[PDB]
Design a protein around this ligand. Structure first.
Ligand code: XI3
Ligand code: XI3
Ligand code: NCA
Ligand code: NCA
Ligand code: CL
Lengths: 469, 469
């Protein structure tokens, strides 16, 4: 079982002896600091509140196990067994903490308060920063959702430019990162953060997380189609690649099917196997069940252009109303090797320069989508900004001399609409003056209970693009 | 509960229909492909075998749950219920799989088979690659352990050059990465891959993972010391940084204590507060309990050098037998910001040029140690190499025209010691010829049971550096 007593950085165990004497309150906030990723999607906190923070999280056994571990870990007795016993006996193991947060799915510019944490009992002044480590891991669902939405921005721009509309935009970036992430739990969290912006996923674990912690009107959060891998092609033997292709397309004749075609020679497969030997099987296919040719190797842009050029000469190409070339509706393409936000931009721009519509293509991303991201990318940070000591509050901050980018905000914080409809974070309790209207943070957690929640449908609506609205 | 049926890439649900008819065996292997990271530490598979693969992993309830999710996910009934029901009835939900692997902790050059997977029942030919996604996630503990051990090599070289020995080498790279990773489960896995090489960690989760899945003779795998964060300093007030310092070194007067000193001005704090105002508190400290000044900002190399020059002029420096300057034993330094393998190399090289011993310093790394890594880095791959169809085995592989690096191995594989003491992977069953001694691959899993396991103590032994030997 999970033990929140053992779910923190080791040094935090010793933090209670470091605060000034008579500290009654510790108040802290989370932000994506300014340093392009100018705006972030807030998503993932609700998962953490339910899975790890709500309910009876303290028991006598959990106190005892933390005791025994920390005695040997530090080779000394520094564990605050008294304060954890106080929480057990006084609150039946419920955390005396208040967390206020911007609604999930909201798109907020960099450098604004996203959530705040404070203790609701003077005796638990140390508890605020104890749970810093758990809460800061929200950087990851925030960064996946933000990085995924930025790629959707690129995709929407070139789809609209080459086709005249945004049809099928939500299926243009498909999650292929299950194997490429660091764990099963990461796969679920990251796939759900992708599904805030798109509908296509192969990481099954995201669907379960969404249903369990957020919910949707529809039965399934994400969708997928039948597809081949190298083992199901190569197992037929090198000389029988055509037999594998024919068997697979026939097996899924009425639904869309993706067939990786680069096992030996991608160019030969598109020109000779799909384009000649098996062309009859492809042309008969329905509009709703196209053959999706997937290259998996080589330079991502060079491969897509040569693949499209080959198919354009074996298959009937039309020109759409914007003047961009279109494969017949039974034939499409997916590029799922080496796709990240940077190469995605290079591919669609190169496709447009060669007059190919983005309608022809979808993208799969693995490591780029879920694994190649860090807390440093959006500068996610958690800092103390206000404490009460001897009954007097003081506005608290850091201001390192060698880096003004690491300066932290001062005092009690609030998030507001500006008169022009933008966002601003008010410092030093100044939101109490009511010059900017109402604080947009809501209490989402108080004294062990989740007090406000959002369905995954609300989050998706919140996270939409302007071009979509 | 965890459902193995919902723990794979979506398209693998459809793969049982794509293999050639009359296929009785699918045999697949894992390698860190060649393309410096010339050798990898094999670590982490035993965690996955116990947590996810062993025992009764299939139930009627699980099969039903999977059936309903996949019907909506694909908008088609494609799930192989008969195959999963066959496993329930014939083997009480135990997976008919055999996994052979190199012992954990072994240091193997790139491009060598590390483990193989095959089905043991002809009806379950599809199951070998169903569990590809689960197994491939071993890239992460392998990559953390490899990257951490390479940094230990760098540290070992420069400590030895500057001090004449390796005393304290195992404590020179400290895991700060708990908050910087993507999830709780990732934190446990990655911190345990670090403890294969070092003893210092602030990520408590990794300790429980080791004790539960690997084990140690010692009470705990990793250790830590009391340490301050910015909140415990800044909470005292901007004009009271000196009061916070003095309160903390007195609260932890008999154990080693790390104090972040860059809240406002790292160089003022070293020169004036530690250097003059609190110097008396410092000089009296024991060798066993030094003050560890920690800079958390600026250029990592420039800050460490300036910090050491400042301290060298306020405290009595000695010159060791190699001619390198040594702080007094009650005073040490830790750089725990912006540290990865590249900058770690720049720091110790810069310290050597300025004639500072590596004895003076340790390093703390967070994102670099546990989160800034991908499967691309060691090119961890899982590919099918052998199948039996119609009673005949055939050697299977991919060989994309665009990339020579993506070529896979052929046939049944074995791992051997060469005459010169190196390693070789024999293809096409040629290990049967017995010209190369015993296969170093061992059956670690068969038909639902873990058949050989290793203690964390033997893993640390296997992963030792040559310089340590
Ligand atoms: C693994 C994977 C599978 C499919 C898609 N995908 C669906 C698209 C879509 N839809 C959704 C289905 C009904 C309807 C539809 O016409 N389908 C067929 C279709 C159309 C275009 C493309 S391009 C690559 C595949 C494909 C398939 C509306 N519209 C636009 N682009 C879409 N891409 C992307 C993937 F990464
Ligand atoms: C968070 C943290 C804590 C300690 C270390 N750490 C211990 C070292 C060691 N030891 C081990 C303990 C007993 C004994 C010892 O002298 N201790 C105190 C000590 C000595 C050197 C240094 S340098 C930075 C900190 C520090 C502390 C022998 N020998 C060499 N270098 C060592 N670094 C590194 C960290 F990142
Ligand atoms: N459906 C796919 O093509 C896929 C899924 C997961 C990983 N790689 C590719
Ligand atoms: N002990 C430390 O100094 C520490 C731990 C975790 C994160 N940052 C710093
Ligand atoms: Cl209890």
């Amino acid at each position: 079982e999970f033990n929140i007593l053992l779910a923190t950085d080791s040094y935090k165990v010793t933090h209670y002896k470091q605060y000034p004497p008579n500290t009654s309150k510790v108040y802290s906030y989370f932000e994506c600091r300014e340093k392009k990723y100018e705006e972030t999607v807030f998503y993932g906190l609700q998962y953490i509140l339910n899975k790890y923070l709500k309910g009876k999280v303290v028991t006598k056994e959990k106190i005892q196990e933390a005791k025994d571990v920390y005695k040997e870990h530090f080779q000394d007795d520094v564990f605050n067994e008294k304060g954890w016993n106080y929480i057990l006996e006084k609150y039946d193991g419920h955390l005396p903490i208040e967390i206020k947060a911007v609604p999930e799915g909201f798109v907020i510019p960099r450098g604004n308060v996203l959530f705040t944490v404070e203790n609701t009992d003077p005796e638990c002044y140390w508890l605020t920063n104890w749970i810093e480590t758990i809460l800061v891991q929200s950087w990851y669902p925030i960064t996946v959702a933000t990085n995924s939405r930025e790629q959707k921005k690129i995709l929407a721009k070139y789809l609209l430019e080459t086709s005249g509309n945004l049809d099928g935009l939500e299926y243009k970036l498909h999650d292929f990162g299950y194997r490429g992430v660091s764990s099963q739990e990461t796969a679920g969290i990251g796939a759900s953060a992708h599904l805030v912006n798109f509908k296509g996923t192969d990481t099954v674990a995201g669907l379960a997380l969404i249903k369990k912690y957020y919910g949707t009107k529809d039965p399934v959060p994400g969708y997928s189609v039948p597809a081949a891998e190298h083992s199901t092609i190569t197992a037929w033997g090198k000389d029988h690649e055509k037999d594998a292709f024919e068997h697979i397309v026939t097996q899924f004749s009425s639904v869309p099917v993706s067939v990786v075609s680069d096992s030996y020679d991608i160019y030969n497969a598109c020109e000779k196997i799909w384009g000649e030997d098996l062309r009859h099987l492809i042309v008969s296919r329905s509009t709703q069940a196209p053959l999706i040719i997937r290259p998996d190797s080589g330079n991502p842009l060079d491969t897509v252009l040569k693949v499209l050029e080959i198919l354009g000469k074996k298959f009937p190409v039309t020109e759409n109303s914007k003047g961009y070339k279109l494969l017949p509706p039974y034939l499409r393409v997916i590029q799922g090797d080496g796709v990240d936000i940077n190469t995605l931009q290079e591919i669609v721009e190169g496709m447009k320069q060669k007059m190919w519509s983005i309608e022809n293509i979808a993208f799969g991303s693995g490591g780029g989508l879920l694994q190649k991201l860090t807390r440093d990318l959006l500068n996610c940070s958690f800092k103390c900004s206000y404490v009460v000591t001897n009954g007097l509050g003081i506005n608290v901050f850091k201001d390192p001399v060698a880096d003004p980018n690491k300066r932290s905000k001062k005092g009690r914080l609030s998030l507001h609409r500006t008169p022009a409809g933008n966002f601003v974070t008010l410092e030093e309790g100044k939101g109490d003056l009511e010059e900017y209207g109402q604080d947009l943070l809501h209490t989402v957690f108080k004294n062990g209970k989740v007090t406000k929640s959002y369905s995954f449908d609300e989050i998706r609506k919140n996270a939409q693009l302007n071009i979509e609205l």
